């Protein structure tokens, strides 16, 4: 009867509890290996030979301090395949050089590809527009830029974020100290997008929950709604009046409201990705030249920006010795910047 | 179609095979840690193996294509 491809397409697109689809073949093994490798790294694999750190439960770390640490700086931008010239098939040496981070990173890249393809496939089979995959392009941009394009522009994989909690905090403070990323305007747009998306989520939830129609006699109003009803469950006119006379402007179009909720975080993530891509090559908004000139010509001239520059110097100088152990930075106590030193 | 939860939890085989398999996995993990097999498999140092007598510093790997030999030199003894 049917061809083999048609039978495989019928089985993959079966309406079961966990949809597989054609995207599932790429998604499920890659995501499974990413999560499994992260648990394996945070559970057993050390960071003693790459960072001189303990980042596993086997070494005594908790959930915050355990991480899948990035490879060593000497590895460069190697793919760090298990069969590659660095490990040469030795699983122990592959774990010791940080190859598990590359395992997780590559499998997570292809797992994000698989999940976006899953969104496309389910939207096509269900019959709706694929705006969820466009929304998920945001986190894909974040992961690509930060975990791939930033280290690929830097010396090695060593300066990529390590898959942990305190490791991510280290990445935050390291990027602030060596890059002044708070001063970067694309990061400012990203912060604006994230905080405005949280604002939109909270305000839309509150407005809908506070402009509902009295569709039941019970004081708890959650049961007064059926998914198959035709009428709206909350008053758009009352909400529009409330926000027109409270804030000055208000949404009148529900569709535009929800596209704005879609757009704000997506734009924030994409602009912050542009900022991180700029940081990848040390093309930074680190300094304002005129402020530095005026501070050099006038010792009494001081702004909060100059204080931030001094704090970045402190971060770099007090962090580089133990944060980049491969460089063998030996900084004496007199070259270390101190507030009392001047 | 799908298998309901009541049929899953009321199955007699479902309980006996779990009772004979899952504690075996738990003890297998316990012995994978407690016998020192995890340290040897994953290369994680023992608490007495972070520093050696000759190496009192951080064992950094400084070459890419001789990393296996350098790790064997650093982790010997």
């Amino acid at each position: 009867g049917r061809g083999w491809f048609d039978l495989i397409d019928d089985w993959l697109k079966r309406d079961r509890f966990v949809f597989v689809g054609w995207s599932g073949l790429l998604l499920f093994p890659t995501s499974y290996l990413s999560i499994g490798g992260w648990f394996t790294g945070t559970t057993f694999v050390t960071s003693w030979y790459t960072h001189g750190l303990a980042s596993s439960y086997l070494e005594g770390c908790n959930f915050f301090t355990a991480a899948v640490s990035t490879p060593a700086n000497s590895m460069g931008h190697s793919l760090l395949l298990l069969w590659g010239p660095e490990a040469q098939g030795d699983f122990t040496r592959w774990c010791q050089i940080g190859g598990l981070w590359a395992f997780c990173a590559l499998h997570g890249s292809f797992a994000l590809i698989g999940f976006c393809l899953r969104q496309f496939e389910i939207a096509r089979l269900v019959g709706i527009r694929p705006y969820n995959a466009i929304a998920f392009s945001g986190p894909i941009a974040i992961f690509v830029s930060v975990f791939l394009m930033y280290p690929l522009g830097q010396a090695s994989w060593f300066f990529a974020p390590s898959l942990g909690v305190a490791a991510i905090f280290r990445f935050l403070l390291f990027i602030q100290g060596f890059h002044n990323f708070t001063l970067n305007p694309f990061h400012m747009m990203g912060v604006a997008g994230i905080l405005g998306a949280a604002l939109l989520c909270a305000i839309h939830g509150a407005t809908v929950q506070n402009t509902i129609f009295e569709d039941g006699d019970a004081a708890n109003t959650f049961r007064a709604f059926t998914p198959t009803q035709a009428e709206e469950t909350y008053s758009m006119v009352t909400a529009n009046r409330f926000w027109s006379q409270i804030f000055g402007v208000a949404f009148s179009n529900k569709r535009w409201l929800h596209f704005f909720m879609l757009f704000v975080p997506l734009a924030g993530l994409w602009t912050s990705a542009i900022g991180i891509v700029g940081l990848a090559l040390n093309l930074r908004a680190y300094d304002f030249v005129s402020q530095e000139l005026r501070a050099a010509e006038d010792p009494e001239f001081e702004t909060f920006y100059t204080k931030n520059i001094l704090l970045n110097e402190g971060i770099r100088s007090w962090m580089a010795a133990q944060d980049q152990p491969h460089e063998n930075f030996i900084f004496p106590e007199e070259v270390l910047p101190r507030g009392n030193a001047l | 179609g799908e298998r309901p939860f009541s049929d899953i939890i009321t199955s007699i085989r479902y309980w006996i095979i779990h009772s004979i398999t899952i504690p075996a996995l738990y003890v297998a993990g316990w012995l994978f840690v407690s016998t020192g097999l995890a340290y040897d498999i994953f290369g994680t140092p023992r608490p007495n193996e972070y520093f050696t007598q000759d190496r009192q510093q951080v064992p950094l790997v400084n070459d890419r294509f001789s990393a296996k030999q350098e790790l064997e030199d650093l982790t010997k003894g």
Binding site: V18, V20, T43, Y57, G60 | R3, A28, V33
Partner: peptide, 30 residues
């Protein structure tokens, strides 16, 4: 025997193995 069985057992056997490993690691004298 279905795909859901395999999807559960992928996230179950190593989960129990890791939970046992972590419970064993809780008793290592630091």
């Amino acid at each position: 025997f279905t795909f859901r069985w395999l999807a559960i057992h992928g996230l179950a056997v190593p989960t129990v193995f890791f939970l046992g490993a972590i419970t064993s690691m809780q008793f290592i004298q630091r």
